[PDB]
Design a protein around this ligand. Structure first.
Ligand code: ATP
Ligand code: ADP
Ligand code: ADP
Ligand code: ADP
Ligand code: MG
Ligand code: MG
Lengths: 1558, 160, 198
């Protein structure tokens, strides 16, 4: 989009015009017929496309070569990206754009000042505002070439700095040689010359003075006296008020002079007589020669065997390091490494001053520095790019946190570091090394520095070949006393030494006396922040005195600063310990607070406006308001923040109300962006880099920061507060360790550097810091929001205010009824009352999940809102007789106790529900039902204000015969009706809820009975696994909802307008817990529940849910596969715990079903009750013994009883004349098929058979036991159309005939038939018979599982499908297989069997897709694009072929799903393994819930004997003279006695196989 | 062999043994990781010639129908469905799977379908090889006359 | 599990009870109060864990995820990360860790008994048995400074062989009337170490 490209590149312009015209013609011809076949039918379209691609590649290569030529023309243009450099090329004639890229090209030169016509640049300007005037101005007119005039600018800047330094040294010679120094002349000199120039001039003067003194005892004493005199002049000058720039210059210069004084004292303490002594050679040395005509090399910086030339690059002001002796040792070893042509590498714990020391060294040498925060996202091409940028400029690399660099990549970049080291060693003696298959010029000023922390977060170590290239240096304990003394003396304090010597051991005792905490920091960063705050508050107090020199209370100032910095960090217990420490360190301590009347009043006003409880310091809100004020102080004085505390301590409301109050005070709008870091991947959070082309996309936080930096909508003027509402771990928070540091910038892999403007404050809202590192704890300011900061009575007052105002259906009758309810529950909430005592008792009780206050409090508030809605509905129902006051009182006073009961004890068992009921009855004077045995939980408050029992509500219904075990029919009982009412109460308000309980407890049945009552909500069923990602929720939203643009943002709504879409998650806690204690799906769901939406990762735009609610189901967290949820998520979501019905309920629950199904036989109806009573304790005893401890699949639920009743009903529907013995046989066969196929060992199978026999004998006496119970007990429908028992031998003959036929058509592989294979084929046929029948066969490979499945599917007319797994079988090919299978199942309406093995699964996506297909019956997010349209056309064609006419899309999809449910049968083959079984239980709940498990196992001894005897019966093996041995080795039981020769040898073959096992 | 055998030869002797044994019938030597492995298998199945495949560590499940010996009987014609192609399985087709690492575990699905032949080293074989090498490097005339005498005695027993 | 329960009833015989003993100006008193409170919390947690694991090994109690992990690591024989609150050398085995914890519990019991009755200064302590010995030393320094109204910055240590610290062990040296002497012995035990702040 630039016209300069046409002029500069005419040939390329013409080529691109020709290509564009040809492509225009091509796309017009394509758009004239959008069919794929019609596009392919174009003559020569492939050749035209190939020619166009070749031309595009040629012009792209030409433009890239030209751009790289321009980079080679100007070496600093290697930093600029392609688009920005193209904009520079197209904007050569106008120079208004060029002033926004100097930050990346210069260390401190923020902008340059030009002429009014911009034909000549006159000087540079600093970031702060300082300026440097060029000796000769650079005019671009006589040098129109960009590279030429920019190089002229560079050399002019160099010679300008050199001339200014020479003039400054000639001036400071006079001050050095003078006994007394006049402050006016000193100050005008300091104002005349820049900060770096005056500091280096002091260095040069000191080195020249000490050298001359040593050339000439007494002269050294004279030099020390001169230094002390200059220091006294500096202290006198800095004690008074000064402009800020001069104050910073004086501070830097006084730090340098006190360091020089210490060095001279150390030299004079020993006896030095020559300049060759190492005690003098080991310190900084500066030399200046006026005779050198090359002004660039005029200054030489020297240490012990290390000669250097000054960088002469403008740096601004920066900050001067305090010259600790540890810093001197670090300087010595770094400069030794630089002389040895090896990059330096300091290391140690965080906060010791490593990267800042390297930065200060680079500034001392005058070298440009670049601090990089390397992370695991650094790619090799990106690292080579930043390396070549350093090499072709001379900038010092300062890679921070080098250990987290993906150790294979660390080894890979060791080669580049080796090439750079070798190139520099050759340079030390047209010098060029090869980087990324390209020879690149190397600047002589190169340096690579490594700042790494050993053992920080289990980061990767360094390879030895890379360690050999870096000179290690350990720094652990910096001189805290010396740094404190020097900085206090710099800032100006009379008793600086006393203050430092009192404050450094104070931190030493503070780090040890207090309790150990994960968010406590008392490092050098905290000490420096304390000292800087002390300086600021000292300047402020000086101004406060001076508005009306003298002395000031320095001790009081320091104590005030240390309190304002440290007391919000503390817990409530350690504040007295800190106060005692301050008392003993400083006796005359005192304190000062308050003086915040204006902000305090504004905070009061906004707290009243937003329905919050205010406190003045000692009232109910005093602690919270004090914490808000502490947060404000930390925001003012600090950079990064975090609000640490348990879930529900008022941190979110605290920072919100502070932002609003600050906006009210200062008049600047406060925009806050709330980001959840773990709800999306770190790649999405920070940004993506394409390995194919080096193009950078912005992540969420990076995009927000880029928008703020650009400030197209005046974003710089407004206050920006970025908050990370999540939990912290060192995978993503270590990317901000340079952002939260004093560097104040964000680094990116592509090299783009984003500074942070002062308007932005980056905060966190976390729960605990137990997983973050000290490197990120030490950088921010801690505000500890304790649990008791927020109080239950403040929560009650907020709830009552939100009830009195802000009506539910958003004067009005809702308003008046809400006010009446508030006035009649006022005496209950306040002070102790009732609810607080009940809550304390509930906390004393234990629950299935962890109980917090706000979970049950939100539960209570929603129940009371439903009570108000019920009163409104009754008022609308009775317009002539509205709600009377005393009736409303006597109704709400009982709804309250019912609601607190079902809120606090809604997730417990019956015994503890009764316990809480008895406690409440004992503790309150509220009208209660009079029943010493019936608990309060068994009652319902009526609209008339009286207690109505649920036992009167539950009717004795008799379901019809047509539906006996249908998926939707439920018989009402006490638990079902109570949970039904509770679920309706929740779902009326569109509130999240979690059904917790053991598997098969009926929780989804209760939820669906609730959803069928309200016609306005439609269910979308979702299933979670171990490897569940929020992409599942995203694709559910994509399929069932649409994105709409609105003036206030984008919104997400269901496609069916006027309805509420509800999401049902069956395994909500099952997603895996990562290494850092979080679940991405859970954090995502919590984010959209709290803030009403999420962030759309396509364009990083906030989306708002319109009509979406969530309902959850889960097992208890104590289960082997499940994990506990987070408090920050469990706060908003009530949990109801449904348990197993037990005997006293199950008896009638299945008695009604059995009496409904015993109607086709009018003679058997007297056996229904003993039959149900018999089926009860078999289930009870199976529950008693086969616990989940023995096997992961030993779960017994009433789903088995439902399958039992359905199986009996399907058995005797056509049979129509059944005796008692036949009924008992059907019952026993169903019991065997439900409770024996899942067993493993033969002993428990024998136990189940004995149990069946004894149960039948106990409950059904005087019956034909031999007729009812037999050995084979088989049942089949092959021989006769009715489901009748079959004889084993007749069945075997029929099956042999079936195999003899079957070998011809499908597979000519012979098989051997025996009893176990007969049982297996009957089991597989029975399971294939029922619709939506899915298998799970466990057994050793080679047992015939898939062959028998093929045989059954061939008999039953099922098309067998095998996935045909091969090499490089990937996800897209698996999805193609699945979509072909689903098309052939749901569109063609054919019976299909899916056979696939465990070994056929290569990725967890395979198991996830199989999980959702097995459970839901459909795979959302599988059919997209025109393929979806082809599927829809196929579906409508199938509907037309069937006969039913359908329309739209959603009902067609529902019919397709019903067809898939009816048709697709899926079979799984596994191998028995202890790890594999529980692994698949964790990673696939459908495989063990919606699939019936058959345990084939290995072949039994009897099966081996029978197959051997059958196979070896065709040859002569009988010995007429055979002697039976007396030992008789018996391995197969029930051997015939006496055995023959063939029997003995078959027993021997069995023995051989068993001995191979052992 | 009845199941198609898998040989575990870390020494390389068994591979040369099977090439020298099935020398008259053409053996195509190939490996699992080779690009022209499926084409080689198709050529082997069509032509009905022996095939030897090395490096069974990277076993692909495309050989599962062949190892399971599943077959479709189209009258007198023998048909096998290998992947997505129907191939006339000649009865004279044999496949051998080689291995160079004895320290390899196998999944049970592969373990069931193949016959394992382990070519390890034993005391008698090692002692005989070392003794013969010592004789070759020490007593060349005695060693060569011993080789001649054993070859003569073997063919004389053939004459018997 | 039979031998596991045998060892499980074997270990906790030396762990019975601990008091908690709360607002005084005495740094030694407040330090001892918070330390015995931490020790009592740890002892109660350990006793509850042992009771739960005994119940699930022999009794009517199913195994949760936490109890399954605990019983697995106790059969394995390595110390859990939940119990390891204080400093343990390079992962000591549970056999010696329970003895170390028992010694700490008895020491804290004696501390609580002495504090129940200043008399706190006259006690004799062993430095290795406390959770935070540097907190103990700084509390002693704070007590001396509070008593004598001195300066914390220039407070040195004179060591004689007025605070009694026991359990200190040397390394290749011998002590005779506060005169170090080199020896071939691996380590020697200091009977009683006097600490005076001068
Ligand atoms: N000063 C206060 N007075 C009254 N109610 C308050 C006050 N501060 C907070 N609350 C209540 O606290 C409830 C919980 O929300 P809040 O934002 O305060 O939680 P939080 O501490 O940020 O929680 P989390 O740590 O789980 O994110 C709110 O519904 C609000 O009504
Ligand atoms: N000797 C010193 N003089 C002045 N400031 C120091 C000194 N040592 C450390 N600092 C301060 O500590 C911080 C240095 O961070 P640093 O410890 O180098 O990061 P890292 O922990 O990654 O090494 C800076 O804020 C710096 O001002
Ligand atoms: N009170 C009841 N009345 C009738 N059937 C019940 C009752 N309680 C449980 N069931 C049966 O138990 C089964 C519960 O299974 P389901 O609710 O799907 O388990 P989950 O909730 O774990 O998915 C249902 O098939 C239902 O027929
Ligand atoms: N009852 C049987 N009689 C004869 N052969 C059998 C029998 N069961 C399995 N086989 C043999 O096992 C082979 C495949 O076993 P199968 O278990 O069906 O496959 P997989 O082991 O992959 O599950 C077939 O070639 C068949 O010859
Ligand atoms: Mg660093
Ligand atoms: Mg919050």
């Amino acid at each position: 989009g630039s016209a300069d490209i046409k002029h500069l590149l005419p040939v390329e312009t013409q080529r691109f015009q020709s290509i564009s015209t040809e492509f225009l013609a091509l796309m017009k011809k394509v758009s004239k017929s959008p069919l794929v076949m019609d596009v392919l039918n174009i003559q020569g379209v492939q050749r035209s496309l190939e020619r166009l691609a070749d031309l595009l590649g040629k012009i792209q290569k030409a433009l890239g070569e030209y751009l790289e030529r321009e980079r080679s023309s100007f070496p600093r243009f290697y930093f600029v990206g392609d688009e920005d450099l193209l904009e520079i090329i197209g904007n050569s004639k106008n120079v208004a754009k060029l002033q926004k890229h100097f930050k990346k090209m210069f260390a401190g030169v923020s902008s340059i000042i030009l002429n009014e016509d911009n034909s000549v640049v006159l000087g540079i300007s600093s970031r702060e505002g300082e300026e440097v005037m060029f000796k000769t101005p650079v005019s671009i007119t006589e040098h129109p070439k960009i590279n030429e005039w920019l190089t002229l600018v560079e050399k002019e800047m160099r010679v300008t700095l050199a001339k200014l330094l020479a003039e400054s040294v000639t001036e400071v010679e006079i001050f050095g040689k003078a006994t007394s120094i006049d402050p006016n002349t000193y100050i005008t000199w300091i104002d005349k010359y820049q900060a770096q120039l005056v500091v280096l001039s002091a260095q040069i003067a000191w080195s020249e003075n000490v050298e001359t003194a040593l050339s000439s005892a007494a002269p050294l004493h004279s030099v020390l006296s001169n230094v002390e005199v200059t220091l006294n002049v500096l202290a006198d000058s800095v004690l008074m008020e000064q402009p800020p720039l001069r104050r910073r210059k004086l501070e830097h210069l006084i730090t340098e002079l006190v360091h020089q004084r210490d060095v001279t004292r150390s030299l004079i303490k020993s006896k030095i007589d020559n300049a060759k002594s190492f005690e003098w050679l080991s310190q900084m040395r500066f030399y200046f020669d006026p005779k050198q005509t090359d002004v660039l090399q005029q200054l030489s910086i020297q240490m012990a065997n290390a000669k250097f030339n000054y960088g002469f690059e403008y740096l601004g002001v920066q900050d001067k390091l305090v010259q600790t002796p540890l810093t001197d040792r670090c300087y010595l070893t770094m400069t030794q490494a630089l002389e040895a042509r090896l990059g330096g590498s300091p290391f140690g714990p965080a906060g010791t001053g490593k990267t800042e020391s390297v930065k200060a060294l680079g500034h001392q040498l005058g070298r440009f520095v670049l601090v990089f925060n390397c992370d695991e996202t650094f790619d090799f091409q990106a690292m080579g790019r930043i390396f070549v940028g350093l090499c072709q400029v001379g900038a010092w690399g300062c890679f921070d946190e080098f250990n987290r660099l993906e150790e294979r990549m660390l080894s890979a970049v060791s080669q580049q570091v080796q090439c750079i080291q070798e190139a520099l060693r050759e340079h030390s003696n047209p010098i060029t090394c090869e980087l990324l298959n390209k020879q690149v010029k190397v600047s002589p000023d190169m340096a690579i520095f490594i700042t790494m922390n050993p053992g920080y977060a289990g980061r990767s170590n360094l390879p030895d070949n890379l360690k050999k290239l870096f000179r290690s240096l350990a720094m652990t304990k910096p001189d805290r006393q010396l740094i404190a003394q020097v900085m206090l003396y710099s800032q100006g304090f009379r008793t600086a030494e006393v203050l430092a010597n009192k404050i450094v051991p104070f931190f030493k005792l503070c780090d040890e006396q207090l309790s150990s905490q994960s968010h406590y920091d008392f490092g050098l960063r905290a000490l420096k922040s304390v000292l800087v705050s002390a300086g600021n508050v000292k300047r402020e107090r000086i101004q406060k005195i001076k508005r009306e020199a003298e002395n000031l209370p320095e001790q009081e100032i320091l104590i005030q600063s240390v309190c304002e910095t440290m007391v919000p960090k503390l817990v409530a217990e350690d504040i007295p310990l800190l106060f005692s420490l301050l008392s003993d360190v400083f006796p005359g301590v005192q304190y000062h607070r308050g003086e915040m009347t204006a902000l305090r009043e504004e905070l009061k006003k906004v707290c009243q406006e937003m329905y919050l409880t205010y406190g003045d310091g000692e009232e109910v809100g005093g602690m919270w308001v004090e914490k808000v004020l502490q947060l404000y102080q930390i925001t003012q004085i600090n950079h990064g923040l975090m609000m640490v505390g348990p879930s529900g301590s008022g941190k979110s409301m605290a920072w919100r109300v502070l932002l609003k109050a600050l906006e009210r005070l200062e008049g600047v709008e406060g925009v806050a962006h709330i980001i959840d870091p773990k709800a999306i991947s770190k790649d999405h959070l920070y940004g993506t880099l394409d390995p194919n082309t080096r193009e950078w996309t912005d992540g969420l936080f990076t995009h927000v920061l880029r928008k703020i930096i650009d400030s197209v909508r005046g974003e710089l003027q407004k206050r920006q507060w970025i908050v990370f509402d999540g939990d912290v771990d060192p995978e993503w928070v270590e990317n901000l360790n340079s952002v939260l540091d004093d560097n104040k910038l964000l680094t990116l892999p592509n090299g783009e550097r984003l500074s942070l403007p002062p308007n932005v404050r980056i905060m966190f809202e976390v729960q605990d810091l137990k997983y973050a590192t000290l490197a990120t704890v030490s950088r921010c300011g801690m505000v500890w929001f304790s649990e008791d900061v927020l109080s239950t009575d403040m929560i009650f007052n907020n709830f009552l205010a939100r009830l009195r105002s802000i009506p539910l259906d958003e004067a009005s009758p809702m308003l008046q009824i809400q006010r009446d309810a508030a006035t009649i529950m006022q005496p209950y909430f306040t002070s102790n009352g009732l609810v607080t005592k009940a809550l304390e008792h509930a906390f004393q009780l234990e629950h299935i999940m962890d109980l917090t206050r706000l979970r049950c409090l939100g539960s209570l508030f929603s129940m009371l809102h439903q009570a108000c809605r019920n009163v409104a509905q009754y008022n609308a129902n009775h317009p002539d007789f509205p709600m009377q006051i005393e009736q409303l009182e006597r109704y709400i006073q009982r709804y309250l106790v019912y609601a607190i009961l079902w809120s606090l004890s809604g997730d417990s068992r019956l015994k503890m529900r009764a316990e809480l009921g008895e406690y409440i009855r004992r503790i309150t004077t509220v009208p209660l039902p009079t029943a010493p045995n019936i608990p309060i939980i068994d009652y319902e408050v009526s609209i008339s204000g009286e207690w109505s029992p649920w036992q009167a509500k539950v009717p004795q219904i008799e379901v019809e015969t047509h539906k006996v075990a249908a998926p939707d029919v439920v018989v009402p009982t006490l638990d079902t009706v109570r949970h039904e009412a509770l679920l309706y109460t929740w779902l009326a308000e569109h509130k999240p809820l979690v059904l917790c309980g053991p598997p098969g407890s009926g929780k989804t049945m209760t939820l669906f009975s609730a959803l069928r009552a309200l016609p306005d909500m439609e269910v979308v069923g979702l299933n979670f696994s171990s490897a569940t990602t929020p992409e599942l929720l995203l694709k559910t939203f994509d399929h069932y909802c649409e994105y709409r643009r609105t003036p206030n943002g984008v919104v997400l709504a269901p496609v069916q307008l006027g309805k509420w879409l509800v999401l049902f998650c069956d395994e909500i806690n099952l997603p895996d817990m990562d290494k850092y204690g979080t679940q991405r799906v859970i954090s995502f769901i919590r984010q959209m529940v709290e803030h009403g939406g999420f962030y759309r990762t396509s364009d990083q735009t906030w989306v708002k849910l319109e009509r979406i609610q969530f309902v959850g189901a889960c097992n208890p967290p104590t289960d082997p596969g499940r994990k506990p949820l987070s408090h920050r998520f469990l706060r908003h979501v009530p949990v109801v715990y449904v348990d197993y019905p037990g005997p006293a309920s199950l008896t009638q629950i299945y008695g009604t079903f059995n009496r409904a199904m015993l109607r086709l036989i009018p003679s058997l109806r007297t056996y229904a009750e003993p039959l149900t009573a018999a089926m009860v304790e078999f289930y009870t005893m199976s529950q008693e013994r086969f616990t989940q401890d023995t096997q992961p699949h030993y779960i017994y639920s009433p789903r088995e009883m439902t399958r039992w009743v359905r199986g009996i009903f399907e058995a005797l529907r056509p049979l129509e004349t059944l005796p008692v013995e036949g009924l008992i046989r059907i019952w026993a066969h169903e019991a065997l098929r439900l409770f024996q196929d899942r067993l493993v060992e033969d002993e428990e199978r024998r136990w189940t058979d004995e149990n069946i026999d004894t149960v039948a004998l106990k409950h059904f006496p005087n019956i034909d036991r031999e007729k009812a119970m037999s050995r084979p007990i088989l049942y089949s429908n092959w021989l006769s159309k009715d489901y009748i028992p079959v004889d084993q031998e007749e069945l075997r003959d029929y099956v042999k005939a079936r195999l003899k036929v079957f070998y011809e058509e499908e597979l000519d592989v012979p098989l051997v038939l025996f009893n176990e294979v007969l049982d297996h084929v009957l089991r597989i046929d029975r399971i294939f018979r029922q619709p939506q029948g899915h298998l799970l066969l466990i057994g050793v490979s080679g047992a015939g599982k898939t062959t028998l499945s093929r045989f059954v599917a061939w008999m039953n007319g099922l098309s067998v499908y095998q996935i045909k797994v091969h090499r490089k079988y990937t996800g897209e090919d698996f999805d193609e297989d699945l979509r072909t299978v689903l098309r052939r199942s749901g569109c063609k309406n054919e019976k299909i069997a899916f056979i696939m093995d465990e070994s056929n699964v290569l990725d967890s996506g395979f198991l996830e897709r199989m999980n959702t297909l097995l459970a839901n019956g459909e795979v959302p997010g599988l059919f997209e694009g025109d393929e979806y349209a082809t599927l829809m056309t196929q579906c409508k064609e199938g509907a037309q072929k069937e006969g039913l006419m359908l329309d739209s899309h959603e009902e067609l999809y529902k019919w397709f799903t019903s067809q898939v449910i009816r048709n697709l049968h899926v079979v799984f083959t596994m191998n028995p393994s202890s790890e594999g079984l529980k692994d698949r239980a964790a990673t696939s709940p459908a495989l063990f819930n919606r699939c019936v498990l058959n345990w084939f196992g290995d072949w039994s001894t009897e099966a081996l004997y029978q197959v051997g005897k059958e196979f070896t019966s065709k040859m002569d093996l009988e010995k007429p003279n055979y002697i039976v041995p007396d030992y008789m080795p018996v391995v197969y039981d029930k051997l015939p006695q006496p055995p023959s020769h063939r029997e003995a040898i078959v027993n021997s073959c069995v023995f051989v196989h068993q001995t191979l096992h052992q | 062999f009845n199941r198609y055998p898998l040989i575990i030869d870390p020494s390389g002797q068994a591979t040369e043994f099977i090439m020298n044994e099935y020398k008259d019938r053409k053996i195509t030597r190939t490996s699992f990781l080779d690009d022209a492995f499926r084409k080689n298998l198709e050529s082997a199945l069509r032509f009905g010639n022996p095939l030897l495949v090395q490096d069974v560590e990277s076993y692909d499940p495309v050989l599962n129908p062949v190892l399971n010996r599943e077959v479709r009987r189209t009258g007198g014609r023998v048909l096998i469905t290998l992947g997505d192609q129907d191939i006339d399985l000649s009865p004279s087709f044999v496949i051998f799977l080689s291995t160079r690492d004895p320290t390899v575990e196998f999944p049970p699905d592969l373990c069931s379908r193949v016959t394992f032949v382990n070519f390890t080293v034993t005391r008698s074989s090692l002692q005989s090889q070392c003794l013969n090498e010592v004789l070759k490097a020490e007593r060349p005339d005695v060693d060569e006359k011993r080789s001649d005498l054993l070859k003569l005695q073997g063919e004389f027993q053939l004459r018997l | 599990h039979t031998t596991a329960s045998n060892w499980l009833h074997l270990i906790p015989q030396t762990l019975s009870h601990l008091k908690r003993t709360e607002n005084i100006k005495d740094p030694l008193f407040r330090f001892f109060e918070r330390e015995v409170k931490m020790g009592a919390k740890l002892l109660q947690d350990v006793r509850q864990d042992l009771a739960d694991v005994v119940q699930v090994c022999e009794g009517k109690k199913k195994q949760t995820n936490y109890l399954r992990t605990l019983i697995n690591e106790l059969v394995k024989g390595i110390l859990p990360r939940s119990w390891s609150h204080y400093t343990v050398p390079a992962g000591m085995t549970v056999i010696q860790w329970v003895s170390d914890f028992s010694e700490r519990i008895k020491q804290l019991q004696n501390i609580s008994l002495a504090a129940a009755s200043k008399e706190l200064k006259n006690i004799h302590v062993c430095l290795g048995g406390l959770f935070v010995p540097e907190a103990y030393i700084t509390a002693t320094r704070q007590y001396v400074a509070q008593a004598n109204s001195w300066s914390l910055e220039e407070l040195c240590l004179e060591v004689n062989v007025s605070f009694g610290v026991t359990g200190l062990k040397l390394q290749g040296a011998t002590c005779n009337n506060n005169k170090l002497s080199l020896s071939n012995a691996i380590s020697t035990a200091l009977p009683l170490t006097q600490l005076r702040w001068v």
